[PDB]
Nucleic acid binder design. Structure first.
Lengths: 87, 135, 131, 199, 156, 80
RNA sequence: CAUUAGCUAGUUGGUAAGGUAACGGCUUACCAAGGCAACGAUGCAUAGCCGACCUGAGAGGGUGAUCGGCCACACUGGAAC
RNA sequence: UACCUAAUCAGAAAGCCACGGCUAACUACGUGCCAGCAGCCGCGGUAAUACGUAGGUGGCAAGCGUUAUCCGGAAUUAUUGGGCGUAAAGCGCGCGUAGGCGGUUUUUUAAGUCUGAUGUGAAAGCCCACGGCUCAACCGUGGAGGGUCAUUGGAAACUGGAA
């Protein structure tokens, strides 16, 4: 179904990722629905992550299901926490 | 013309007829059909090796070769350089470029290529005319 | 037959200016009246006289020449023609001779020049080039 | 070093002294070659445009398609195209090192940058074409601070251009200012290379 | 001092009973690189003397070229016969983007930044005449404001 | 939402419950810029065929009716 | 491309019925003769389309490799589960 | 495996094309309208800077030339931006249909025209700025730009519609 996942945007051995809401059947670097934020795992020390809040909580309420590491990224901003608070 | 005449009859530019037509055509042996390819070079078989008299202002015996290319096309090609080892049934590589004097020769045989030796005594200009670096 | 009365007006000015006639007359029109008064305010011609006859009154134009009989008007060019009309936005208003000449533009604010037309930020029909 | 050739024959074919400040055009100020000693013919427009381009290219030791690439970057910047082009050449790391006074010429300064004796901003920058920005620090590698060649030229350099603050102690530079047309080489007509590339 | 540039040297002929009396004609443009340029031609029996006549011919008639910071005040197209030269003023750092005989004429005047194109015959003499024609039709802001009874600021 | 509306002229009423409406509009030339008149014929439905050849009528689109018609007759304003 | 001028007969409209996720000649009967076309019907040849790429001062001209969106195809041709 | 640190060696690391004018670079020898060169102008017929070679020169350089195809130069389809007396071009001449264009004033409308506001013109691309790879290529961010676009106000001189 609808998945919040990462799209590779990096060169050889220098990956950059966008946090994107996309259909599961779509290709990894192909068709998408919405861009949510970015994820850079090769920055200085801590991997710098950028996430929007309004759209991210909008898609989660609509049934979008984060992958294993988008869950981590949404947790480091407390997004999964505030999603849990609104039961 | 007037603008209305231009609207009804838009301007028509002239078509460009390209030299070396036999390099622009391919062949399909399965369908027995001619195609469009735009090849840099074509490979053929020498069906006749001889010498041609040049145009009237000039006077020199020029070597040439009747080449049937990969297509079913029979063209005449120049042989640059001094000495050549080509007789009948010699596979050659033919590029573009015509000879001004020779009427009916619109191509050049590439020296130093498949079954075509270079110029024996060439020492400056070895990229053209074939032949490797002496010593 | 007559198709562009305005192009006739500019050609009348062009032909009279070439032989340095001091004055000319042409059948008047509201738009041809405004063009004359634009050229007066911009300093291309000396005076505009509009005479009331019964039918299509007469527009008398007094041309201006300089010290050494230097024709003040150098050229006239109709831009918008009946066979092909020209309209311009306020952003792409042309600069005749880098501002050394005026372009007559008919906008919603009346027949005006190209300089202050960019001031009102309005566009219209590019009537003619005067330099 | 790309050229690696005779720096006199180039300055003899050209009209400027390139590197050496006069030592090359003293006994034979004419062109090199068999026909050098005899009289020189006149130069056409193209010959003069090409000559001036070769003057500035061989002065900095750069090759074409990198001289041209740098020229392309210059046109992007605001101002005169010719001025920003020569400013950018004066901002090259290999040229800044020589103009700082660390080496005694252009080619040697290149081998100092190339072999990694510079450590721009404290970090090894071994690219001769690095573009130095105002407000940087061109130091010398600690293990290379006891180089006889470096210290042989640190005192004979004397004049340092105003857009470069040079410290004789600690072997450091600053690049305080953007060079103006005045500080740039005055033997080069910038307007003649701009016209060459527009041809 | 007026710097001179030889534009072209042409060997002409007059057929006589003996045959082909050959002469030489020289086209020379003179200028001062300050806004005074002129052209002239002269025919002699030898090349070096045809230049001197052309130089003297050119120094007589000089055209004052108005200019603002080495560029023309505005855009103009000079015409003479089949020759036509379009001339667009350019930015301070542009340079002289001109062709053949047009390039010499503008360089010998105080023009250093222009965009131009020869929209006509490439015959050198008519190219020069066309180039000069545009330079005399040129108008500066001061004259235009004076002619229209307005201030320079009122024009803009 | 809103379905598009066109105003044209009746050029054919030889079929029952169907008329042909000629909606003439203007299209400028891409290169030369002159506006050229071009016309498009629309086949419209009218259960009570009160439209007669020569009437200017009001046309609004709808779901596909028959192989060609996609429009219905909204308003008839001329008499001719 | 006009040295391709007249093209169609479910064709074009209507009335019923059927069946389609759904409107609809989509199909079938019966009515009427209709419908498109020099604003290029039809026919022939060529071609995947686009974002985009090359060139040019611009207007334009050429192109549709790699990357992304859409389409179509899976030895050739039919069919359904 | 990047990468860094120690020793060691100038040692293992340049060729291609041009040099008659366009078009930067000229001499000598061999040949003698031959052999050959050539994109065009053209060269070569015992004293070729045009052929082959040798020196020198010049242009680039891990590349250099040739060929194939596109745009430019070509204003040589001219909308920007061409013409038709003699260079190519006014139909042999009327009557006329579609179409194209159309005299002056007033009122109205608002299709064109102009000026806003929304929605969209995906992303990646071009340009600008900024940041990260030692620089650059490259990468990533932020703008910009891109439509005969759709909806909806406002203006009414011009073109269009009505009186």
């Amino acid at each position: 179904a609808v998945k919040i996942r990462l799209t590779r945007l990096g060169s050889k051995r220098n990956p950059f990722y966008r946090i994107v809401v996309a259909d599961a059947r779509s290709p990894r670097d192909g068709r998408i629905i919405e861009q949510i934020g970015t994820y850079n795992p090769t920055s200085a020390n801590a991997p710098e992550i950028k996430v929007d809040e309004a759209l991210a909580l909008k898609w989660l309420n609509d049934g979008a299901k984060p992958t294993d590491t988008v869950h981590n990224i949404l947790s480091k901003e407390g997004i999964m926490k505030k999603f849990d608070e609104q039961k | 013309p007037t603008i209305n005449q231009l609207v009804r009859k838009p301007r028509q530019s002239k078509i460009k007829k390209s030299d070396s037509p036999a390099l622009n055509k391919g062949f399909n042996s399965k369908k027995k059909k001619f195609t469009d390819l735009n090849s840099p070079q074509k490979r053929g078989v020498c069906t006749r090796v001889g010498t041609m008299t040049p145009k009237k202002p000039n006077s020199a015996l020029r070597k040439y070769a009747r080449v049937r290319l990969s297509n079913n096309i029979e063209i005449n090609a120049y042989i640059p350089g001094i000495g050549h080892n080509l007789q009948e049934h010699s596979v050659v590589l033919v590029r573009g470029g015509r000879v001004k004097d020779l009427p009916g020769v619109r191509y050049h045989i590439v020296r130093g290529a498949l079954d075509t030796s270079g110029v024996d005594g060439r020492r400056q200009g070895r990229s053209l005319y074939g032949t490797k670096k002496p010593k | 037959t007559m198709t562009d009365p305005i192009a006739d007006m500019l050609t009348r000015v062009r032909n009279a200016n070439m032989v340095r006639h001091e004055k000319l007359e042409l059948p008047a029109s509201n738009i041809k009246k405004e063009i004359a008064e634009i050229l007066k305010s911009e300093g291309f011609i000396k005076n505009v006289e509009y005479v009331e006859d019964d039918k299509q009154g007469v527009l008398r134009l007094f041309l201006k020449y300089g010290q050494n009989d230097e024709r003040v008007i150098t050229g006239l060019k109709r831009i918008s023609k009946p066979g092909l009309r020209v309209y311009a936005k306020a952003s792409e208003m042309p600069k005749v001779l880098n501002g050394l000449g005026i372009a007559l533009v008919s906008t919603s604010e009346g027949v005006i020049t190209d300089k202050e037309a960019r001031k009102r930020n309005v566009g219209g029909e590019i009537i003619a080039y005067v330099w | 070093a790309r050229f690696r050739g005779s720096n006199w024959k180039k300055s003899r074919r050209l009209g400027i002294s390139l590197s050496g400040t006069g030592k090359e055009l003293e006994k034979r100020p004419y062109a090199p070659g068999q026909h050098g000693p005899n009289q020189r013919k006149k130069l056409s427009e193209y010959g003069l445009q090409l000559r001036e381009k070769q003057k500035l290219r061989y002065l900095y030791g750069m090759t074409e398609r990198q001289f041209r690439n740098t020229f392309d970057i210059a046109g992007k910047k605001f101002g005169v195209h010719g001025e920003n082009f020569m400013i950018l050449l004066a901002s090259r790391l290999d040229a800044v090192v020589y103009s700082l006074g660390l080496a005694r010429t252009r080619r040697q300064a290149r081998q100092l940058v190339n072999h990694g004796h510079i450590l721009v901003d404290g970090k090894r920058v071994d690219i001769p074409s690095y573009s130095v920005k105002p407000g940087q620090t061109i130091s010398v590698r600690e293990k290379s601070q006891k180089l006889n060649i470096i210290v042989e030229s640190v005192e004979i350099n004397n004049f340092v251009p105003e857009y470069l603050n040079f410290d004789a102690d600690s072997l450091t530079g600053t690049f305080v200012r953007l060079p103006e047309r005045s500080e740039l080489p005055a033997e080069i007509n910038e307007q003649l290379i701009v016209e060459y590339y527009s041809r | 001092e007026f710097e001179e540039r030889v534009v072209t040297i042409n060997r002409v002929a007059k057929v006589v009973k003996g045959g082909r009396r050959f002469r030489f004609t020289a086209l020379v443009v003179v200028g001062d690189k300050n806004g005074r340029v002129g052209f002239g031609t002269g025919k002699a029996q030898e090349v070096p003397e045809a230049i001197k006549k052309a130089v003297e011919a050119a120094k007589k008639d000089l055209v004052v070229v108005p200019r603002v910071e080495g560029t023309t005040p505005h855009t103009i197209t000079g015409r003479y016969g089949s020759g036509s030269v379009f001339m667009k003023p350019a930015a301070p750092g542009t340079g002289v983007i001109a062709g053949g005989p047009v390039r010499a004429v503008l360089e010998l005047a105080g023009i250093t930044d222009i965009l131009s194109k020869s929209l006509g015959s490439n015959t050198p003499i008519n190219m020069v005449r066309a180039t000069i024609d545009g330079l005399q039709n040129l108008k500066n802001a001061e004259d235009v404001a004076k002619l229209r009874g307005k201030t320079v600021e009122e024009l803009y | 939402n809103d379905r598009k509306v066109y105003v044209g002229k009746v050029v054919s009423d030889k079929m029952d419950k169907t008329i042909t409406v000629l909606v003439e509009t203007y299209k400028t030339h891409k290169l030369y810029g002159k506006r050229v008149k071009y016309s498009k014929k629309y086949k419209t439905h009218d259960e009570n065929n009160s439209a007669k050849l020569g009437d200017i009528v009001k046309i609004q689109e709808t779901r596909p009716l028959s192989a060609t018609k996609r429009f219905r007759l909204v308003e008839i304003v001329e008499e001719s």
